[PDB]
Amino acid sequence: MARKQCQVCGQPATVRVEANLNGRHSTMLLCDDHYRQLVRQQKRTVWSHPQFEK
Ligand SMILES: [Zn+2]
C-alpha cells in the first residue's frame, strides 16, 4: 500500500530504490532518468571503452 511517487518530480517512478540504513529498508522511488543520474554520481566502477584503442 501507500503509493509513492518520484520524490523529486511528480512523475510515476518506474524504479524502486531500496537502500539499507542500519537494517532499515528505505524504499525510495525515482524515475529512470533520476536513478541513472544517481548512479552516475557514484562514478563508474568497472567500465571500459575504446578511446584510442583499435
Ligand atoms: Zn522523476
Cα(13) to centroid(ligand 1), Å: 6
**Ligand 1 centroid from CA 36, angstroms:** 11
Ligand 1: distance of its center to the CA of 26 in Å? Answer: 18
Distance in Å, CA 38 to ligand 1 centroid: 12
Distance 10 CA to ligand 1 centre (A): 6
* Contacts with 38 (C-beta within 8 Å, 6 or more apart), sequence order: 17, 30
How determined? Answer: NMR
Amino acid at 43: K
**Sole residue written with cell 524504499:** 27
Closest CA to 16 of 42, 40, 41, 38: 38
Q: Which of 11, 54, 2 is nearest to 34 (CA)?
A: 11
C-alpha cell at 24: 532499515
47: part of which helix (H) or strand (E)? none
Longest dimension (CA), the chain: 53
- For residue 37, the surrounding DSSP H or E stretch is helix 32-41
CB 31 within 8 A of CB 6: yes
Place of cell 537494517: 23
User: What is the Cα–Cα distance from 10 to 22, expressed in whole angstroms?
Assistant: 29
